[PDB]
C-alpha cells in the first residue's frame, strides 16, 4: 500500500460494465458518477492505483477519511472523480504463518497530500536524539508489516483494492443493432445524424475516406465505421399529396 502501483491508461477504449457485473468485488460504490453512466462519459487519462490492504480499513479508502492508511499511505482528494473496487484475496495474498511482504507507513512526519508517493525507509524520530540510521529507543522503523493468515477473521484478511481516478481519447464501447436496409431509419453514424434508407451501392470508395457527398453537399453515401461496406443514403420518401 505504501508503494502503491499507478498505471496510466491512455489512448484506448475502456470497458467498465464488465467490472460492474462480475460480482467478484466486495465493495463497489462510486463517487462523482454512477457506475452505469460512467461508460457513456469519458476522459483524457485514466489512473489505476492498485494495492493490498487489510479489509478492516476499506472505509479509509474514501474521500475525506482519517486513519493510518488514508493519511500516510494513500490519500484521496475531496473533489475525487473515479472510485474504489475492493475484493478479497485470502487464497492468494495470505499464507500460513504470516505473509509479511506487504507493509504500511505506521509513522510519518505529517499527513499526505492527495496522490502522494512515499518509499523512503529512513528511520523515524519519535523522540530527540541523532538516530544516525540505526534502530533503537524512539528510533523506530516507520513501516509496520501486515500479518496475513488463512485462519483469521474476514475483515482482518488481505483485500485487493484498485482505485480508478479520472480527469480526451479514453472513450468506451459502442454498438446498438445491425445495419437496417430499405427502411426509413434516422441513423447515427459516428455522430452524423440523418434520416433515410440505406441501400447497396456501386460507388467504389477509395480505402481511406469514410462517407460520400454530392453536388450541393449532402451526405448521400456512407461507408460504415463498423464492417466496411458501402451504403447509399436516400431521403425518406417525402412527396406531396393531391
Amino acid at each position, epitope marked *: 500500500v505504501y508503494a502503491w502501483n499507478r498505471k496510466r491508461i491512455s489512448n484506448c477504449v475502456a470497458d467498465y460494465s464488465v467490472l460492474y457485473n462480475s460480482a467478484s468485488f466486495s465493495t463497489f460504490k462510486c463517487y462523482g458518477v454512477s457506475p452505469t453512466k460512467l461508460n457513456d462519459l469519458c476522459f483524457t487519462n485514466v489512473y489505476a492505483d492498485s494495492f493490498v490492504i487489510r479489509g478492516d480499513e476499506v472505509r479509509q479508502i474514501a474521500p475525506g477519511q482519517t486513519g493510518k492508511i488514508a493519511d500516510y499511505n494513500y490519500k484521496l482528494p475531496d473533489d475525487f472523480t473515479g472510485c474504489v473496487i475492493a475484493w478479497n484475496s485470502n487464497n492468494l495474498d495470505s499464507k500460513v504463518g504470516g505473509n509479511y511482504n506487504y507493509r504500511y507507513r505506521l509513522f510519518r512526519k505529517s499527513n499526505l497530500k492527495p496522490f502522494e508517493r512515499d518509499i523512503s525507509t529512513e528511520i523515524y524520530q519519535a523522540g530527540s536524539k541523532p538516530c544516525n540510521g540505526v534502530e533503537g529507543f524512539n528510533c523506530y522503523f516507520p513501516l*509496520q508489516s501486515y500479518g496475513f493468515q488463512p485462519t483469521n477473521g474476514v475483515g482482518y484478511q488481505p483485500y485487493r483494492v484498485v482505485v480508478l481516478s479520472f480527469e480526451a481519447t479514453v472513450c468506451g464501447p459502442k454498438k446498438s443493432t445491425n445495419l437496417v436496409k430499405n427502411k426509413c431509419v434516422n441513423f447515427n453514424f459516428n455522430g452524423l445524424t440523418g434520416t433515410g434508407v440505406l441501400t447497396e451501392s456501386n460507388k467504389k470508395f477509395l480505402p481511406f475516406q469514410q462517407f460520400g457527398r454530392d453536388i450541393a453537399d449532402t451526405t448521400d453515401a456512407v461507408r460504415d465505421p463498423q464492417t466496411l461496406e458501402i451504403l447509399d443514403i436516400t431521403p425518406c420518401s417525402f412527396g406531396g399529396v393531391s
Partner: antibody, heavy 117, light 108 residues
C-alpha cells in the same frame, strides 16, 4: 528523560466539569501517538481515548460525546475536558504514549478523580 | 469487544516454584496478546509482546505463550519484586480492554 506528569484531578459534583493536563518530557505531544486511560477499583484498566499526530480523536463508546480532548500546542501538554461526569467515573487517569494504535509503550503517574455527593 | 477474564485471580506461591498464570480471550485472536506487570504504586511495564517475545530486558524467566482462547504466563524463580499485578491485553479489537489483574505475592 522520559516523564509524563499529570494534573487536573479533584472532587467535582456529578454533573460538573473539570479539565486535565499531561505535561510530557523530551517528546512531542502533537506529533506522537498517545492515549488517555483510566483505572478504577473493581473494574479493569480501561481505554478512554487515543490521539494521533494531528489526526483524529478516538473515544470509548461509553464516554463518546461526553469527554473531549484538545491538545494545546504551546508546550508538551495534553489536555482532556470532562463534562457531564456520571457516578461511575471515579478513576485515576493516565496519559500513556502508544506505538500507533497497537500497544501502550509508556505511562504516566496518573491523576485521580473522585466524583460523589 | 474482548472482555478479559483472569481465571487465577489471586495466587500465593512459594519463593521460586515456577508459578503459572493464565487468561482466556472471549473472542478469537491468533497470538495478539501482550502481558503487563503493574507494581505497587509504580508504572505498569510490559512483559511480553505478541504473546511469544520478550521486549527489552525481560528475562528468560518469563515463558508466556498461548493462542486463540487460552493464554499462559510462566514465572520461573520468583524474586520478591515479582509480587505484582499481571495484566493481559489484546491487539485486535478497538476499543482495547486490559486484563482484570492477577495479584501475585510471595509468602513470607
Amino acid at each position: 528523560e522520559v516523564q509524563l506528569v499529570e494534573s487536573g484531578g479533584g472532587l467535582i459534583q456529578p454533573g460538573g466539569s473539570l479539565r486535565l493536563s499531561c505535561a510530557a518530557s523530551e517528546f512531542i505531544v502533537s506529533r506522537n501517538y498517545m492515549s488517555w486511560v483510566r483505572q478504577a477499583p473493581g473494574t479493569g484498566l480501561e481505554w478512554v481515548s487515543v490521539i494521533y499526530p494531528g489526526g483524529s480523536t478516538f473515544y470509548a463508546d461509553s464516554v463518546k460525546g461526553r469527554f473531549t480532548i484538545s491538545r494545546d500546542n504551546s508546550k508538551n501538554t495534553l489536555y482532556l475536558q470532562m463534562d457531564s461526569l456520571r457516578v461511575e467515573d471515579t478513576a485515576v487517569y493516565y496519559c500513556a504514549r502508544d506505538y500507533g494504535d497497537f500497544y501502550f509503550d509508556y505511562w504516566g503517574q496518573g491523576t485521580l478523580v473522585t466524583v460523589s455527593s | 469487544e474482548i472482555v478479559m477474564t483472569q481465571s487465577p485471580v489471586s495466587l500465593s506461591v512459594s519463593p521460586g516454584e515456577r508459578a503459572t498464570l493464565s487468561c482466556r480471550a472471549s473472542q478469537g485472536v491468533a497470538s495478539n496478546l501482550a502481558w503487563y506487570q503493574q507494581k505497587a504504586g509504580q508504572a505498569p511495564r510490559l512483559l511480553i509482546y505478541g504473546a511469544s517475545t520478550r521486549a527489552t530486558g525481560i528475562p528468560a524467566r518469563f515463558s508466556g505463550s498461548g493462542s486463540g482462547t487460552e493464554f499462559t504466563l510462566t514465572i520461573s524463580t520468583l524474586q520478591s519484586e515479582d509480587s505484582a499485578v499481571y495484566y493481559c491485553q489484546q491487539y485486535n479489537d478497538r476499543p482495547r480492554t486490559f486484563g482484570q489483574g492477577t495479584k501475585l505475592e510471595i509468602k513470607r
